Amino acid sequence: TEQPNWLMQRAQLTPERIALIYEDQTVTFAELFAASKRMAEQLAAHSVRKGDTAAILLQNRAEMVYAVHACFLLGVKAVLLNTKLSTHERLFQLEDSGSGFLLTDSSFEKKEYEHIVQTIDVDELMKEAAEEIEIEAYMQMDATATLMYTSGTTGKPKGVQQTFGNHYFSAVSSALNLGITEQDRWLIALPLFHISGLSALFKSVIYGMTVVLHQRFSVSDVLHSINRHEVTMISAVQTMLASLLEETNRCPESIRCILLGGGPAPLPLLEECREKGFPVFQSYGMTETCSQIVTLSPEFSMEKLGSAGKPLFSCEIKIERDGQVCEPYEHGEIMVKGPNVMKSYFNRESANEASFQNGWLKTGDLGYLDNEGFLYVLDRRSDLIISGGENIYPAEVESVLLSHPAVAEAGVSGAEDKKKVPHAYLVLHKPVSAGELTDYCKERLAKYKIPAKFFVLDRLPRNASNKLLRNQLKDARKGEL
Amino acid sequence: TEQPNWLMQRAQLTPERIALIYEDQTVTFAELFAASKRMAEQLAAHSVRKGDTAAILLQNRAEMVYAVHACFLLGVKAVLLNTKLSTHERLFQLEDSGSGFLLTDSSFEKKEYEHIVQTIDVDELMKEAAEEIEIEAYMQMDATATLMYTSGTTGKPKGVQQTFGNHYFSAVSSALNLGITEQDRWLIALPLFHISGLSALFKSVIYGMTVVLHQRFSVSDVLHSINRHEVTMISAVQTMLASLLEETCPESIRCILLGGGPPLPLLEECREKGFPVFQSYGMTETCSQIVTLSPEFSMEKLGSAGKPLFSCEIKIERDGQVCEPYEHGEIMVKGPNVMKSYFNRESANEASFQNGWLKTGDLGYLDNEGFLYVLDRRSDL
Numbered sequence A: 001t002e003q004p005n006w007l008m009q010r011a012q013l014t015p016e017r018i019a020l021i022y023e024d025q026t027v028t029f030a031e032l033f034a035a036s037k038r039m040a041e042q043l044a045a046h047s048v049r050k051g052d053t054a055a056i057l058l059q060n061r062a063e064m065v066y067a068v069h070a071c072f073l074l075g076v077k078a079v080l081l082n083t084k085l086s087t088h089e090r091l092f093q094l095e096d097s098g099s100g101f102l103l104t105d106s107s108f109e110k111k112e113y114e115h116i117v118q119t120i121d122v123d124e125l126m127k128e129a130a131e132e133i134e135i136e137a138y139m140q141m142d143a144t145a146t147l148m149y150t151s152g153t154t155g156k157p158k159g160v161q162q163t164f165g166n167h168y169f170s171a172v173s174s175a176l177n178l179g180i181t182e183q184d185r186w187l188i189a190l191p192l193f194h195i196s197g198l199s200a201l202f203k204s205v206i207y208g209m210t211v212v213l214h215q216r217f218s219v220s221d222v223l224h225s226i227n228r229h230e231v232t233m234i235s236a237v238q239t240m241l242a243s244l245l246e247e248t249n250r251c252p253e254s255i256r257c258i259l260l261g262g263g264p265a266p267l268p269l270l271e272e273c274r275e276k277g278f279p280v281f282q283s284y285g286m287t288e289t290c291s292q293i294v295t296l297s298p299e300f301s302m303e304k305l306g307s308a309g310k311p312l313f314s315c316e317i318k319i320e321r322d323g324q325v326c327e328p329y330e331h332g333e334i335m336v337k338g339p340n341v342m343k344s345y346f347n348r349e350s351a352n353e354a355s356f357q358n359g360w361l362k363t364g365d366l367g368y369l370d371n372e373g374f375l376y377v378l379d380r381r382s383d384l385i386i387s388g389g390e391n392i393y394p395a396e397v398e399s400v401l402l403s404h405p406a407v408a409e410a411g412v413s414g415a416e417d418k419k420k421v422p423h424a425y426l427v428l429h430k431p432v433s434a435g436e437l438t439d440y441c442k443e444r445l446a447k448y449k450i451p452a453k454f455f456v457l458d459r460l461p462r463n464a465s466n467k468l469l470r471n472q473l474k475d476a477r478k479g480e481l
Numbered sequence B: 001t002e003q004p005n006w007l008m009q010r011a012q013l014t015p016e017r018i019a020l021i022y023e024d025q026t027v028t029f030a031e032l033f034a035a036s037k038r039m040a041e042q043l044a045a046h047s048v049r050k051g052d053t054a055a056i057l058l059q060n061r062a063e064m065v066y067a068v069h070a071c072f073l074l075g076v077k078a079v080l081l082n083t084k085l086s087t088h089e090r091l092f093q094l095e096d097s098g099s100g101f102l103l104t105d106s107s108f109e110k111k112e113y114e115h116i117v118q119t120i121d122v123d124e125l126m127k128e129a130a131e132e133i134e135i136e137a138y139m140q141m142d143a144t145a146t147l148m149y150t151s152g153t154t155g156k157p158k159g160v161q162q163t164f165g166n167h168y169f170s171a172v173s174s175a176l177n178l179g180i181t182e183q184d185r186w187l188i189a190l191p192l193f194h195i196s197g198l199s200a201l202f203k204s205v206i207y208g209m210t211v212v213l214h215q216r217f218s219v220s221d222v223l224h225s226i227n228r229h230e231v232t233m234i235s236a237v238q239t240m241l242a243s244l245l246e247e248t249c250p251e252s253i254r255c256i257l258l259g260g261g262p263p264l265p266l267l268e269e270c271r272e273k274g275f276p277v278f279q280s281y282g283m284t285e286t287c288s289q290i291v292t293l294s295p296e297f298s299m300e301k302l303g304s305a306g307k308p309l310f311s312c313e314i315k316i317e318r319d320g321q322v323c324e325p326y327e328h329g330e331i332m333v334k335g336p337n338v339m340k341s342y343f344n345r346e347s348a349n350e351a352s353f354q355n356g357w358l359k360t361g362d363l364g365y366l367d368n369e370g371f372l373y374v375l376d377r378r379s380d381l
């Protein structure tokens, strides 16, 4: 039911291992526990009470790391806010979460939220003095540690309640998938308010592993940093990976693991990764699962094109259609289970009752398993297009459209015909003929899947997580033929 | 509260990794799961049902490993009997544990136990046909997996109830401690009925790590195995460590896990000849080690057990209050790898547990830097 605070214990065990390398600075676990302890004392001074909820609105900085751990030490549910949310979107999550506080800095417009929560400035806060406190030495495994909002393109975002046990099991289960050395160091250049970034902070204290932290992704800063600090592990999305490949001949020899999240990698991209010696682990997972729950090892990259792999140890997946488990290759909804799967959505009775079934979580993702149990992810249930009687998965068409030389971004929505039909929306680099494109699709897609008409834009309607909002491409800009 | 069966999931994930190296043979996890499922189907034919208690009396053999897993797959508590005990020490434990079965072989006299339990001969048992069964695909974390008796110099042995949870957390904590590698291989030449040998079996299937198994310890056979199979981890008692060092330390070996008492002569020859020896403190109650001392500290934290594994806790108490460094007191352990309760010992359970902590019955102190020094059991003084 409880473990010692990971940071306190990590500090007690290996006080002088590096916890955080951030720009110039290095921070030891002892230092990090010290920083975090005093920040907790300062928050304690501003009336932040055990059992409260503080929201965090910060770019990737050492202070954000301290704030997360400080909340832990005070016993305060931490809400991680996407910094690219609109003012309105932030306000909703502040209200919905029941935050009493917003810990932000001068880089945001604090006063915009003062009317609903007690705003606090990470840097103005740190200067202060306060009565020292006796910290929570124990984490309760079933307590909500962090709340994180989903960013699906359907509906109002849901707060995922992630327990200390969730995070612990995520970290452990991942180490059994990837192994762990004392020489391991992990580069995080993704936001810490997304679970790919946040979970690394917990991997760190639990493994006693250094996290090298970048505020943003810039390929040269990362490559330098990789070499300056002997980085063995990096987390990436497809675009960060594409950039690493074009900026290198071979893969930096320090790197032993590239954890690719977000979506599949197109066949040419992986094939070069194998050629240039890039050890790419593809993965599937979500906010609901506290980072990855399924992974594919490099040695299966080409052999299992399009697969997210197999579940981590202690975890399970299955595929279901109307209450019944699906045969191999039969499309259905992906369901997940394991000690890393979230408690429940916060304050969402309807979604909870609908998304759970006997300890399994319904992910909202469509997919299937092949005979060996590898998982293939189709994309969201909600974006399904039944054109004929048959199903159309937008991610499939977008993929074929995107692989074209002249296509920059592709989006597929289901319009109407006296028979729903598929429409494409292409951002372009070069110009491209609708005949030149229809025949690219002809070669690569069943006829009924191919986009009826084509539209063109300069940008496609994305939410604050860069996710394509399909319901809304009707419309923005002008499309020809 | 539940995990899929470690062996089943491990066989699903990496079917052809080597589970077991024993003598000639090697057994893949797919094979280990097939063998353990078969044996479990054969036990079921002999009326061994879910919720029963089976004792196991065997030397280190591949067949013992199957038996352990067959119990898990059946939902059957496994009692591991020390083969070097007297028959009556064994009969006491069979009665105490409520075993309905004893799995053993020709090496032992079955007729010596059958007036109390049904006896089953592992090798005859295997030769038999059996209908297929629906195995137990989940381990409940809070259920007893194995019952293992205390080697009590302090009176009547107690059955340590070791949960699936305890074993898992023990294996996970140790990994956080030592690190784990695909290339890692662990040699066991110690008895499987002691927790030090048993726990490798669980490490094996949770990590997906090969265990190199050895019926007994003979320096020549062990060093030949170490090299032929590139062992990286090995579990050893004080005696075995003297014997191996006297015959020279293989580059292949990365960790030597030492168990039992704390010898200033001994350790430096290890450092010199190049032995990465990890000193440790554990008990049956903690389902393996709960404290370890890295080689980086042998000199000079002399006489120290080391520091608690992650998730695990160590304090030192006298009267009913916390001692200070370095003031002596009774060592008390705590953590998810620590046994819940002794089997059918109401008095000893309240005696031994003060608020989530286990009174260890050993005395010791912590230094300024919080390392553990273990002195002697409080009993004799």
Ligand SMILES: Nc1ncnc2c1ncn2[C@@H]1O[C@H](COP(=O)(O)O)[C@@H](O)[C@H]1O
Binding pocket: A150, A151, A261, A262, A263, A264, A282, A283, A284, A285, A286, A287, A288, A308, A363, A365, A377, A379, A380, A465
């Ligand atoms: N490997 C993958 N392949 C396809 N879709 C993915 C993959 N990983 C994540 N996703 C999508 O991203 C969602 C998780 O979103 P988030 O909570 O924002 O990380 C999942 O439900 C999937 O729909």
Ligand SMILES: Nc1ncnc2c1ncn2[C@@H]1O[C@H](COP(=O)(O)O)[C@@H](O)[C@H]1O
Binding pocket: B150, B151, B259, B260, B261, B262, B280, B281, B282, B283, B284, B285, B305, B360, B361, B362, B374, B375, B377
């Ligand atoms: N390094 C050590 N120093 C002192 N006593 C030990 C050490 N290792 C094990 N023991 C004793 O062995 C007991 C458990 O032995 P066993 O239950 O047979 O594993 C512990 O309670 C300790 O008292």
Ligand SMILES: [Cl-]
Binding pocket: A180, A181, A182, A207, A208, B176, B177, B178, B179
């Ligand atoms: Cl380590």
Ligand SMILES: [Cl-]
Binding pocket: A343, A344, A356
């Ligand atoms: Cl639930």
Ligand SMILES: [Cl-]
Binding pocket: B105, B106, B107
């Ligand atoms: Cl025999």
Ligand SMILES: [Cl-]
Binding pocket: B228, B229
């Ligand atoms: Cl071999």
